[PDB]
Ligand binder design. Sequence first.
Ligand SMILES: *[C@@H]1O[C@H](CO)[C@@H](O)[C@H](O)[C@H]1NC(C)=O
Ligand SMILES: *[C@@H]1O[C@H](CO)[C@@H](O)[C@H](O)[C@H]1NC(C)=O
Ligand SMILES: N[C@@H](CCC(=O)O)C(=O)O
Ligand SMILES: N[C@@H](CCC(=O)O)C(=O)O
Lengths: 441, 459
Amino acid sequence: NSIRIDGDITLGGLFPVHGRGSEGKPCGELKKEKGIHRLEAMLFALDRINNDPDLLPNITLGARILDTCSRDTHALEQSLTFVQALIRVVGVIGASGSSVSIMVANILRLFKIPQISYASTAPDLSDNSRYDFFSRVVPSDTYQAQAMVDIVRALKWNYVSTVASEGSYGESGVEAFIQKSREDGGVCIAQSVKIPREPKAGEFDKIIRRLLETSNARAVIIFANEDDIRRVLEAARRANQTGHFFWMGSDSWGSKIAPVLHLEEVAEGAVTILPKRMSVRGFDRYFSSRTLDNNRRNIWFAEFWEDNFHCVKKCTNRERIGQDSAYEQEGKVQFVIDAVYAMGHALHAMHRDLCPGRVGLCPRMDPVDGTQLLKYIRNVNFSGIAGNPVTFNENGDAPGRYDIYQYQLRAEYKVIGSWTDHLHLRIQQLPRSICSLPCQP
Amino acid sequence: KKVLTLEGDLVLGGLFPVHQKGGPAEDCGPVNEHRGIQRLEAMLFALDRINRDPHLLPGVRLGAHILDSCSKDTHALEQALDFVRASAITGVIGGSYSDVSIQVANLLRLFQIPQISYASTSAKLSDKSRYDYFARTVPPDFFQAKAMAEILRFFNWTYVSTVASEGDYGETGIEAFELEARARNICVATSEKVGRAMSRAAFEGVVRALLQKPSARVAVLFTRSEDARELLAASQRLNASFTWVASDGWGALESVVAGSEGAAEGAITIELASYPISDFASYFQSLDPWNNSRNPWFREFWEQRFRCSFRQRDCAAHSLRAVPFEQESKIMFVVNAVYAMAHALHNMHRALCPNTTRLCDAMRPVNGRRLYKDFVLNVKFDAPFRPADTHNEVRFDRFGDGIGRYNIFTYLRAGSGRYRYQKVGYWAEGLTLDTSLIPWASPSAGPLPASRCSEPCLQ
Ligand SMILES: *[C@@H]1O[C@H](CO)[C@@H](O)[C@H](O)[C@H]1NC(C)=O
Ligand SMILES: *[C@@H]1O[C@H](CO)[C@@H](O)[C@H](O)[C@H]1NC(C)=O
Ligand SMILES: N[C@@H](CCC(=O)O)C(=O)O
Ligand SMILES: N[C@@H](CCC(=O)O)C(=O)O
């Protein structure tokens, strides 16, 4: 299944519109927040660059977006379409998955295709020697590890436990956090919990048993995927531990309804970190406007229409996205809008230099070279749709600037601080998770 | 760059770590004298016997397309495209390093290219969900951590420190060892991880961290060959006494300990049990840089070993038949990997084309679905060059692995013999090593070196 758009040059893309599937099935239940909300964002972005004449005049941009069901193995088979002819896409947008993007970055570098990701924050992916053509528009998790230590220190937390999921994100997340925890020497790790990729039903129950084993470890930090946070949160309800644990979430648990859907009892008092973001007005009036028989390009949009609205029979075409009361403009939708813009700006700069005077695609750059285009991406400096400045580094990373969100009840995430350079957290939460209480003078 | 171009009806791939990693320098430079040319010539020796075997693929004339990985995952995958240019690579026999083998396996899976690894002990390739076209003869890192965990329990070593090598080999070994240590009441101290490419000053940092828990006289080592020598070199400088429990990376090869040979006196190393090949000993010894034109790297190998040059009219006098020959402990696995699909191709030939001992025009397009799935099945056959009074047999389990046969090695300092590796036991699903052979475990030597965190307290 592909949503290819005919154009002068095609842009590769990987979006997890589906989820990881249990058993032999390589695909699971459809993911509303990750995927589809970001799938049409790039399409909306691709429909805006081709409209204005100030960016790539008389040059239409195609697409070769595919499906990755949150599976590392399934992502490599689909990516073969990009390099089938070179065994032609000019650039490929990396997938959200940290482990998924790694397996696409070590094969696209063989055929020299630059990669720009939007939701992968692997500290490993910052190695220039192994990942030559990988570019990132979000700060790495190594900056989050320092931020979490600063947050817990401001909250006087001393005894915490870490939970990580299998892959290159959870394993590389807690490890960075643990190493930076020892550097300050203020906080210590009670224990490390490993979540298998394909565990049993009772395995998650055993996870909460180890957390309850250290009953004084009130605060627990989780580095898990989107579908793993909900399962661990659900296990707390079945163990009668509502309120005993305060959850410490990473960027995988930003402002998102799905991890807190039908679970607003254990998720209360949970503080999470998300990078800089803003609510873009352009995409607000785009997703709510697209309906059936209009956005026929997106094959999975029909599945999105069925799953979201039914939440059964009588599938009449008389409902709108606005009345669903579930459209929130997910935080990482912005990061894919400017991801293609950075690659588009690099192509515009490349077009001007290699084709002087030629408004159209001059034949001098018809066989686009990834190595030549790679240096242009590193020097892109412009302003995004919301207004944030988009700039890369020598390793292709992004400056570290985050936001602190704390889940409140009145069920809406509220900004309670920031991590510009050191900290900006302003007092809610409650002081706890302190072992070795003062034993009096 | 330089590749072997043996020709035949169907060619067979290969990927060996001929050179050593150069790090910040060039991609890979100096050759390997034990895991390089010795393993490289093992495949050619095995291929020559098959091509002259009337009972194994008669008239097929198996070819060779051995590439070069030289201990670099990125370099191995960069040249792995030659294996997929046609898609004619019917199979790939390579991946001596866990990191190298993982990267190649993912690429070859897309084009249904069966792969055999003669040395890959990582306990993740057994997962058929991610690698459904992978088979190997060596055991995984499942019945290897238990052997080292039981040795620690045998010597009552409770408080130990673990050193991990960054990659897909050290991390997997630590996780397997950590769960076994916890289940055996073995305490775990601070664990230090060494990167794939780090400065020599950083290697002094990790040994300092190990010295920051002085009741941890026992260090469990999970490193590759190129990462264990640096730690030993970092042990002579800033002198310290640390007994070593070594993984498969250390092995019995006499190059990771050469030089800094005084800092691993009480080192225990676990390798894979095997036997020397008498026929291969004569083949490797009777080689010359002039006659052996098949190997492009043999000329370079004649420069490091038998130090001379090809420009000043040097060389042409030294012979490998004079100096003693030390066969690598994993040569048996290399020759078993070649014969693994040699019998499978003969079995496939007997069933698909039961008309003549040639190509029947149906086996020309090689498919991984019919080949590997019939190859992971019973290919039980007698091990080639098997010694007498032995019952070894080459076979693959449902996970495409081998039997868990191991052995124990210790480092000797006997007088008038410099240094020597001695086998003191094996692992036949249970420890069997003796105590009278270890120099520091002898009764007339004093208390054994132990690592307990709290001297036990009496009642
Ligand atoms: C991008 O442009 C801005 C304009 O003020 C300036 O900071 C600098 O030239 C660039 N920024 C970075 C971080 O390179
Ligand atoms: C210590 O090891 C010895 C064998 O050398 C044996 O008595 C037993 O395994 C251990 N004994 C105690 C008391 O820990
Ligand atoms: N960046 C995290 C979270 C991705 C997401 O689901 O938004 C990862 O790579 O797993
Ligand atoms: N099996 C060890 C060493 C293999 C070898 O080079 O002999 C590894 O995967 O690193």
